[PDB]
Amino acid sequence: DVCAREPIHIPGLIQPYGVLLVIDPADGRIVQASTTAADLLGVPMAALLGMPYTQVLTLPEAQPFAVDDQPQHLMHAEVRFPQRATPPASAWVAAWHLYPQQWLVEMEPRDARLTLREAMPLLRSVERDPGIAEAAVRVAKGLRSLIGFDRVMIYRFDEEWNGDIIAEARKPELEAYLGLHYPASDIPAQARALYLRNRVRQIADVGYQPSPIQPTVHPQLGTPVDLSDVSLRSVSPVHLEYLANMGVTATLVASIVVNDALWGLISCHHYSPHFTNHAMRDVTDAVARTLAGRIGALQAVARARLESVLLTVREKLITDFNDAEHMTVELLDDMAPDLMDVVDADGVAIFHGNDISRHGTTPDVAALRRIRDHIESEHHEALREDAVGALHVDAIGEVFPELADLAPLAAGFIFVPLMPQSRSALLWTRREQIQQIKWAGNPSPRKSFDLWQQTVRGRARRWSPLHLESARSLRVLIELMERKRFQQDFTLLEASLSRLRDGVAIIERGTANAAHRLLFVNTAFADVCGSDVAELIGRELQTLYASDAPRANVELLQDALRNGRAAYVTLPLQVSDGAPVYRQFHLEPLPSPSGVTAHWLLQLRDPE
Amino acid sequence: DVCAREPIHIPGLIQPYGVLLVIDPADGRIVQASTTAADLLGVPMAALLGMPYTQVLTLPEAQPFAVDDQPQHLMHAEVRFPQRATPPASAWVAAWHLYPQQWLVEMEPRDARVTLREAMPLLRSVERDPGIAEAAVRVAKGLRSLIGFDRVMIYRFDEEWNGDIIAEARKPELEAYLGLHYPASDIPAQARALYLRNRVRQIADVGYQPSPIQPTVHPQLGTPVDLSDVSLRSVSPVHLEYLANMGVTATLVASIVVNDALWGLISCHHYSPHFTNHAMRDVTDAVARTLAGRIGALQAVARARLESVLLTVREKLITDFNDAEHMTVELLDDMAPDLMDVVDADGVAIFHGNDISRHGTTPDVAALRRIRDHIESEHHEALREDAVGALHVDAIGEVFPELADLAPLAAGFIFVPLMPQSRSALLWTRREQIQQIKWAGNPSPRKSFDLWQQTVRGRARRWSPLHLESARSLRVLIELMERKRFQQDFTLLEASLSRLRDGVAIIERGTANAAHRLLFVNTAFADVCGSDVAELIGRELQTLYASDAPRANVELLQDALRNGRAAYVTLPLQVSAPVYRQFHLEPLPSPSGVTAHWLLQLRDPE
Ligand SMILES: */C=C/C1=C(C)C(=O)N/C1=C\C1=NC(=C\c2[nH]c(/C=C3\NC(=O)C(C=C)=C3C)c(C)c2CCC(=O)O)/C(CCC(=O)O)=C1C
Numbered sequence A: 001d002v003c004a005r006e007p008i009h010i011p012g013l014i015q016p017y018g019v020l021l022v023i024d025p026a027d028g029r030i031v032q033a034s035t036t037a038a039d040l041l042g043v044p045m046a047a048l049l050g051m052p053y054t055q056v057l058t059l060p061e062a063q064p065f066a067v068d069d070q071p072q073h074l075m076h077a078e079v080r081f082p083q084r085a086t087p088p089a090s091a092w093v094a095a096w097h098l099y100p101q102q103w104l105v106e107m108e109p110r111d112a113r114l115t116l117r118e119a120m121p122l123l124r125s126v127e128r129d130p131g132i133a134e135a136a137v138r139v140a141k142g143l144r145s146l147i148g149f150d151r152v153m154i155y156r157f158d159e160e161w162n163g164d165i166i167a168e169a170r171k172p173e174l175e176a177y178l179g180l181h182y183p184a185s186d187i188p189a190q191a192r193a194l195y196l197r198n199r200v201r202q203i204a205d206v207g208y209q210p211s212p213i214q215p216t217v218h219p220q221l222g223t224p225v226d227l228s229d230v231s232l233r234s235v236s237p238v239h240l241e242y243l244a245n246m247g248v249t250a251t252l253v254a255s256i257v258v259n260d261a262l263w264g265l266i267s268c269h270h271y272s273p274h275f276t277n278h279a280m281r282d283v284t285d286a287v288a289r290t291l292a293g294r295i296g297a298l299q300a301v302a303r304a305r306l307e308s309v310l311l312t313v314r315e316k317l318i319t320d321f322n323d324a325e326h327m328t329v330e331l332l333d334d335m336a337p338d339l340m341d342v343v344d345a346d347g348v349a350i351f352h353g354n355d356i357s358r359h360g361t362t363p364d365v366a367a368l369r370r371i372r373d374h375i376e377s378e379h380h381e382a383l384r385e386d387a388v389g390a391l392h393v394d395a396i397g398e399v400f401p402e403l404a405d406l407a408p409l410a411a412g413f414i415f416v417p418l419m420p421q422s423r424s425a426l427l428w429t430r431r432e433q434i435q436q437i438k439w440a441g442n443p444s445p446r447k448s449f450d451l452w453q454q455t456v457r458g459r460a461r462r463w464s465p466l467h468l469e470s471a472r473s474l475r476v477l478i479e480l481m482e483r484k485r486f487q488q489d490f491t492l493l494e495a496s497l498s499r500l501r502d503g504v505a506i507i508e509r510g511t512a513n514a515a516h517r518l519l520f521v522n523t524a525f526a527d528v529c530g531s532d533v534a535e536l537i538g539r540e541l542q543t544l545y546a547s548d549a550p551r552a553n554v555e556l557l558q559d560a561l562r563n564g565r566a567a568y569v570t571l572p573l574q575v576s577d578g579a580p581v582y583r584q585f586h587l588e589p590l591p592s593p594s595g596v597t598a599h600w601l602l603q604l605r606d607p608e
Numbered sequence B: 001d002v003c004a005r006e007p008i009h010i011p012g013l014i015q016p017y018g019v020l021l022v023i024d025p026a027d028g029r030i031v032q033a034s035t036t037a038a039d040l041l042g043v044p045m046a047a048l049l050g051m052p053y054t055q056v057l058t059l060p061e062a063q064p065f066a067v068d069d070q071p072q073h074l075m076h077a078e079v080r081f082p083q084r085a086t087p088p089a090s091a092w093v094a095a096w097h098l099y100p101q102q103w104l105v106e107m108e109p110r111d112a113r114v115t116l117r118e119a120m121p122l123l124r125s126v127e128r129d130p131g132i133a134e135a136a137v138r139v140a141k142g143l144r145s146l147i148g149f150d151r152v153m154i155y156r157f158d159e160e161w162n163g164d165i166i167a168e169a170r171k172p173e174l175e176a177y178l179g180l181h182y183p184a185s186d187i188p189a190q191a192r193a194l195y196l197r198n199r200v201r202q203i204a205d206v207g208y209q210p211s212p213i214q215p216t217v218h219p220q221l222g223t224p225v226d227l228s229d230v231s232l233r234s235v236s237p238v239h240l241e242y243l244a245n246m247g248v249t250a251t252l253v254a255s256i257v258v259n260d261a262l263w264g265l266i267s268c269h270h271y272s273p274h275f276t277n278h279a280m281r282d283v284t285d286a287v288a289r290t291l292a293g294r295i296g297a298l299q300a301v302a303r304a305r306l307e308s309v310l311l312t313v314r315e316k317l318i319t320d321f322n323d324a325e326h327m328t329v330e331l332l333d334d335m336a337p338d339l340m341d342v343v344d345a346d347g348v349a350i351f352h353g354n355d356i357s358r359h360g361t362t363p364d365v366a367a368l369r370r371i372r373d374h375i376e377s378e379h380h381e382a383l384r385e386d387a388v389g390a391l392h393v394d395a396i397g398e399v400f401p402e403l404a405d406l407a408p409l410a411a412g413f414i415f416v417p418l419m420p421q422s423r424s425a426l427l428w429t430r431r432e433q434i435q436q437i438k439w440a441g442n443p444s445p446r447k448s449f450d451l452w453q454q455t456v457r458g459r460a461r462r463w464s465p466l467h468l469e470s471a472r473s474l475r476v477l478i479e480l481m482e483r484k485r486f487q488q489d490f491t492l493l494e495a496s497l498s499r500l501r502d503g504v505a506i507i508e509r510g511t512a513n514a515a516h517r518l519l520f521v522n523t524a525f526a527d528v529c530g531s532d533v534a535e536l537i538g539r540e541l542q543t544l545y546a547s548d549a550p551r552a553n554v555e556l557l558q559d560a561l562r563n564g565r566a567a568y569v570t571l572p573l574q575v576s577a578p579v580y581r582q583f584h585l586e587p588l589p590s591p592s593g594v595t596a597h598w599l600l601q602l603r604d605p606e
């Protein structure tokens, strides 16, 4: 928090190995310059300030130019210093950063002796490597041989922005850092952000003399120099403290940017001073690029493969579960392996009112009932809201402290449906996975990096979002269960109704513009009318009584229908053939949650 | 296809610019060799054939070796020819393809003339710019300046393997090819497949003299040379015809391979002869890979963004839809915008037995009923089986020719559920999207490339697999609808039966375990007994009649219950006067026909 609040991009200091000048794109005048400029360029800080760059420039290659909006970056090219008699003992090379209001020229030694063509057999290998692990180690081993670093490691960022050394290539005599876990605070967010912008950075000598930009703020713009893109940018004195405490004298780290996000870093350490020249710096850029590219592709194909297997298994469960009308014991015992696999659970428990069907490695029925009871609690009603489609825990003891135990079999779980009481419910469980976090430290930078193995009990393997959506996708199985149950009970009650002696009908109350329709009619009611049951459903009630029926008796029926009340009247029926069939109409209003009657029960006593 | 039928990988011919030899990994002797070898190597085809390679070429950088299974490929390295009195008018460079039974050495001029270093500002720029379009044009403009080709274009493959020029950089004086559509037959599957294997190919001069491999078939293996990995491999005379008809003299194309699949190509044309040396072929591979990597990342972020918006909206619909027990008109009118957005439809229609709730831009009720009827057809049962979780069409006229019209509003659609009849159903519709496809020809290769704008009607915007999964994920609302309907009807029937004047009870059978128990009982049946409805549920049919009942009348009831048949007997009940009543036991239908429940009714005295 207070660590992440540090400029780091505007230190007003550079590394002493190179020289930096700030040029005004209108005049070509040097507005700001680092103290290291005076010694190489010839002219001291006095006249060097406010001087046209061309008088101290000898660039045989490309030249700087005006930029409209998007800045342009020119590569390291030969630079010579005319206002001095052979100032360097080594070849010098200058890079340009051209922004609309300022130009920045950074120059550093060429160095020579070591390159892109020799990196190609390595790049070509990782491009066709299977799995991130294989590529990561190939890159560390390969890069360690290409540049000459004492140790090269691939630092993968995890979900909480912590880090893990997943690959390492080092001098045999060195203590291995492989598999060591570092907190998220070691690389604060403001640094991580810059590591997407500036993808390769070097520290030639940890604890150097930082060379400051003479006018710290722009003499006419009043702004500090945004050294985000300058490779010479002086690094944090907190990181330089950490690096000295770790015993490293030189650094070179390149970002692994997968899908426009910092996936990890290629961290190189040298326990002696080491300047990585523009050439080696470009080679490490190419390997980081290729490694980020392969990781992404492998991750993309993986997801794509997993999603299609997980779909088949889901679609089989939806079909198999629909096809069977009565949910037998062998049905669920066949379903169980695929019902666990879809979400990658260690066990599953199917609930249907007091009954529980447990499969795989799950707690006992008493505990599965203890877990379900606890979730549907009034106390845990906020959890079900804040949950997305299914409630899930990675560590039962944290979320549900009263279910602290049960962690060995149901440490993690996916509970569906989010609706309380419900009758039908699915509970996927993952058992405890004792995790061993290999800290290189413990919880201003740390002096010691001693191994500290934190043993974490009561947690299960994290539910991947692929497995959480696979769960949400199977909510349809809960509604399948409920529908089929109400369907079974409804047809039973309809069968009992359709075979009654007394002739009954369920009337749906109309509206002002709608009329009262027959919703249900039994064979005894339909036969007294003449028409078959199917033809009479949806027929208006006003149809059933003869278009002759007395005013008084009809108005009594209409008054109850109008007011949603009850009626008992003898009315003649609309005769299909002849004989006047009078029946006594017993209209009774069926209860409504609002008390405002929505349906009636019409029954016509069968004479006996 | 008669196009793809051509085995373009075994032509028995090479491009004349380089030399090819087939070496036996046991002896090191040259078994086969292109006619261009004799002139370069010194020794003519006569003594050259069957000669140890070591005698005819000295390699100071890289040497061949034995391979066990997986072939190895050595890069272009310096090659010198000792059997000739100064044969190099230019520097020569040799590449090796080492297979377990054969070695293949292909050599071509070094050419020289800053390269991989100069490509770096371009590579760093594409990996940082947003959107495939921006990158594609950057690559064409950039690559045109790096390797000086007259025109550079980015050819993106579509769903039906056709191709579209999405980016172009050309000599100003040249007629633009940008936005032109080419058929899938122009690059046969045979070629596309090879373009995954061999990632960069060049034609130095279209209509060259093809130099053949002297023993066309291996002298001891009897097989033709699989030139699939060889850069000198002679190209099809059909493409060379096409290229000459288009007026191009030189070509260089590199594959854009996104997630191990051919996404497109970087096609370069030169209207004068042009040989691209190993170095610029490596530079164009680096840009093709960086562009393929940028395309993939942008596609990955896109999916990631879409999946998270589609999720929120889907869970907004599952909650809102569950919360309401009464499906009001304003209910569905509130749901409608989010119900259309989840699948990115232009309209939606909710069905629930004869009723239809139309929202957005959708056809009329008569048409929505015409469509639904057509899907649940007997002669269209093959579609719903072959469909995954939801049936969907991109162009209604193709799949359903009788539904040829309707396309202006329901050109595309997603229908859920796949089960026929089923009272509840959702139909998402996308309206027609008239496409203007700009052909460079018309339907042996075409002589003319004249513009032909096909005005494509009757199709809608393609249903992304993400929207299709967003649809499958909302199958739960169809089951929500059906559950809530059966629940509403069941409580209604339960309320009704619990009046009726006549005493009613539903008897569950006494299978093996237990006896025949009361499943349901109405208030009229419970009152004649004495006990309340709740206490009487679960009780045996034996417990509610009191020990005063005659043997014969009881045995008549017992006989029907035993056989799963019907009865009608007068039996006394439990006296809380004994109270006799007409026991009318009727067997309720079963799917097996084997009776599982009965309807007991006791006619109320009148
Ligand atoms: C302010 C809190 C910090 C603590 C505590 C600490 O240890 N570091 C803190 C701050 C910063 N770290 C910065 C950069 C940084 N951190 C790492 C971490 C590692 N490097 C390693 O080699 C290993 C293990 C071998 C670890 C865990 C790296 C690699 C970097 C970047 C170094 C580089 O790119 O050169 C940082 C930003 C500094 C800057 O770039 O200006 C801060 C403030």
Ligand SMILES: *C(=C)C1=C(C)C(=O)N/C1=C\C1=NC(=C\c2[nH]c(/C=C3\NC(=O)C(C=C)=C3C)c(C)c2CCC(=O)O)/C(CCC(=O)O)=C1C
Pocket: B002, B003, B004, B006, B008, B177, B182, B185, B186, B187, B188, B191, B201, B202, B203, B234, B235, B236, B238, B239, B242, B251, B252, B253, B265, B267, B268, B444, B445, B446
């Ligand atoms: C049917 C056969 C064919 C017709 C008709 C036709 O026109 N070509 C046919 C066959 C083959 N084409 C092959 C390769 C190929 N085709 C293209 C297409 C284009 N290139 C362009 O520049 C444009 C428009 C500007 C189109 C359209 C391309 C780029 C290639 C690959 C060229 C290369 O990689 O060098 C082949 C395979 C030939 C081979 O490589 O052996 C056949 C057969």
